[PDB]
Design a protein around this nucleic acid. Sequence first.
DNA 1: AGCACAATTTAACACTTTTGTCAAGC
DNA 2: GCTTGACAAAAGTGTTAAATTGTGCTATACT
Lengths: 144, 73, 83, 73, 53, 302, 195, 73
Amino acid sequence: VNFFDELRIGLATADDIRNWSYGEVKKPETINYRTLKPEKDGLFCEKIFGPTRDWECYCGKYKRVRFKGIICERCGVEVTRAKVRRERMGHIELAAPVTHIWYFKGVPSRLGYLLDLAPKDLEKIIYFAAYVITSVDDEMRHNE
Amino acid sequence: RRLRTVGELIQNQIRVGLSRMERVVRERMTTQDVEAITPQTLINIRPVVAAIKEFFGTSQLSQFMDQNNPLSG
Amino acid sequence: PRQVARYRTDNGEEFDVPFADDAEIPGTWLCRNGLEGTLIEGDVPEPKKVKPPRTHWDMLLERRSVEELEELLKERLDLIKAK
Amino acid sequence: LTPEERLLRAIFGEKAREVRDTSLKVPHGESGKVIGIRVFSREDDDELPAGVNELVRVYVAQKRKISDGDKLA
Amino acid sequence: IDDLDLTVRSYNCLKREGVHTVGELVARTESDLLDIRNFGQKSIDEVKIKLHQ
Amino acid sequence: ADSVRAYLKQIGKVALLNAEEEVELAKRIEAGLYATQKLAELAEKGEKLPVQQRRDMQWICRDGDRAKNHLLEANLRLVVSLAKRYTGRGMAFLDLIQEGNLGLIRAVEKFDYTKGYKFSTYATWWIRQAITRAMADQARTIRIPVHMVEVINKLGRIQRELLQDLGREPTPEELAKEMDITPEKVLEIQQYAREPISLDQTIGDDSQLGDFIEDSEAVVAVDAVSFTLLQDQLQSVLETLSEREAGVVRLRFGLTDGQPRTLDEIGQVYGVTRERIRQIESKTMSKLRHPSRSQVLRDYLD
Amino acid sequence: QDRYGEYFTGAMGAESIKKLIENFDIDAEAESLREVIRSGKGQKKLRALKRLKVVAAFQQSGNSPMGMVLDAVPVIPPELRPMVQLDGGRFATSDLNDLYRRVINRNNRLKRLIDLGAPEIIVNNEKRMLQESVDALFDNGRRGRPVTGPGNRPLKSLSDLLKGKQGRFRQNLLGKRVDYSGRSVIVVGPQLKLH
Amino acid sequence: GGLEEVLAELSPIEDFSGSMSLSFSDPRFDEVKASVDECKDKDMTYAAPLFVTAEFINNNTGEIKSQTVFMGD
DNA sequence: AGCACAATTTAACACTTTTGTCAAGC
DNA sequence: GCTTGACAAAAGTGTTAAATTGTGCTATACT
Ligand SMILES: [Zn+2]
């Protein structure tokens, strides 16, 4: 279009991040050491990020522009321009949460100011140098 | 103020290569079957030559000789 | 020239996957969500041949026979009864 | 091959060749006479890093007349 | 329909062509089977020799 | 401040077992497991336990898991002592430690106390395997399978041993001989062992390597335009052919659709045999080869 | 924990921080911070005021403050972190991929330890490692020593792309190389007309 | 010499036990592999192979093992 | 390291269909 | 202007052997 009005930012939520993603990359693998082809489920995986060649799926059963926008039932790669390999994102689903270092270690610490914790104390918590009281039962503590 | 000359710049890089080998010589003694250890079995020269090769390449004191004329060189 | 199949991951999300009509559709598809999902159409044919993984109990059984395990538990309980 | 390219092949009868052309050409804006040539082949005993069968170096030389735009001092 | 143990080539062509039951097979015409993709003469020769048995 | 210092502080808080305790814990682990498996046996066929029998069975299992955890925490120092030696090889020290702990875990699982051997004797095996097996799956940006990492290492030792015997480096022939493999194979292996380099290295001294890489799939404007022009000249030259003559060439090469067609398929549209189409093909091609039509397309050779 | 454990809950790691944010009242901390800037003027007032700027920012915007803790980490498209073979076949790739590799390696190990069951010492160690690896990915060296490659040169993080004279803005955005241009050495034009 | 000077620092190598000692001494160079002209042509480095005498001693068994060692070019 | 064994992938191959081609004739 | 049958190359297709790849394990004692 070339004419847009506003350009906005915000914190990306886990859900925003998941909606951007065309798949979850599950392996720390780049490319095969023999064939030099992208390894499935790794970084560069054609199933998620996209085809290496235009309108060519990984295995090649559908090689032609005749059917764009169909997915190969074997390799699960979509038939379209390899340009999407430039536009498409994945995601990782963490087994434990993680703090965004920009908001923890930025000066002043945003988390520190948000929860009113001293930055040097906030550090001890996220890096497992000390505990933090998450909840306390005020009634049960009083009655007993 | 010195002025570490070429011989010394090489010496220091050799010293580093040996100390990295002494580490493998010390630990090697422990897990090697004793009386089966020889000066060679404890010695692995990879880090010593690497120091030299990695000094002449990638080091800022080791430069491609500047020759468009004898004076430049 | 494409037919669209829908899958449902174990957590409830549903995804549209376009396929070629001529091709045979699968019953499970790795999904953009990162989980396996099941086709909401007829089949849905197969278990996928699950073999259970190896467990600590398995590794203990192959050394201690169940009898030795029983006497050991005997030693342990007779020790708990004495207080 | 593109259809428009495969049609000309049939007409002029030039088989689409099995291999791409990656060849050594002289950089833009350069020129001279070929002085000497050095060839290292794996077929010949020679020597080379793993994977490299043949290495050829070409030395081009030129007389440069003093030209407007050259720097003197 | 699987009691025939047709040569794997014949079973896949028929299964793709959509003959689930032998009742659908006998109705099909011999010229209708050989038009099915990758279905040749040796296919109808094996199917015919088994049907005769 | 350091993350490994932090982890060493905590593993230091536990206490090293002697031979007697290791046996003690081992029993508790096996007792708890059997206690669990039996109770689970009741779950399927029922037959609930008496209350005192159930309350104590629940405690045997809890005590077993408490034992397994105490055996591990007491030996964490052993993992660290082994992982110290494998650093600098391309894995982070913490990652070596953690993988060793995974081996420590299987040692505990598979350890047998009746053999009367000290725990560190059997645990050293698993911890080392877990750490070296880890390095083979991980330490390389481009992964190589364990069987290939196995040979890449063997070839390395041969070269170092042969290096010491020959006062020089061995040629591919000497190496393939000492290893009982073909020299062509040892080359293939030496290519496998090459490791990639950073596109972010600064080679300028001041620009980064990564920005010197051409884009080979980038569209070249002069070709796409001439290809557009070629697509024009063909459309014209084809107009000099009979409607069916041009129609057959287009379908044969897939000009309009992009999908080429077989002689039988083009015979199906015009209602003829494949052979007829093959004939019409030969004629229009000698018509196309005719110089008045071909003269203009010559410069498009490539 | 053993005595009183039933009366309270506590934890470590971002998992705990997530809980504190989960139980949070911005509108509550908003005003309760709003009065303290009125009543308590002093050095504390200067502290409460700054702290208000962040707490207030989250009210007006619809942003959930939960965003500051990550359940999922996005992965940048492959061509922006390419791996390609140079002339001669030797390979070169972005530092981003080894950075993504540590993260995914540690996340997967964490899944493994969780399933076996593992003493907190081991598990907590993984979570601490997982946290640091996602830090290095986003901003490397911003905390602690930077993750380095061979030759001890720090890997380039996502933040390293944007920042500096060589970042996207100054390098590739406010300026750039252009087609239809050239240069040479200049010589005097004394016979030229001014135009 | 600089080489001997850094070799004095290494000798001997002794673990905490002092039960074994690996000693170094007497560095030696052979004649240069290839000539300068030959190296510039063949893309090699002008180098002399270095040799060392490595003595390993077992304090428990009192045995000596003397071995000539190749450090590198 | 090194091996053993199961699992998985790749090649090799036999075999069947399809595609292009020729001669000959309607 | 067109079709038929004999025919060989070419292209798929299923069936099997070889190779490649993944995982478990190693019991003096070693923290
Ligand atoms: Zn495919």
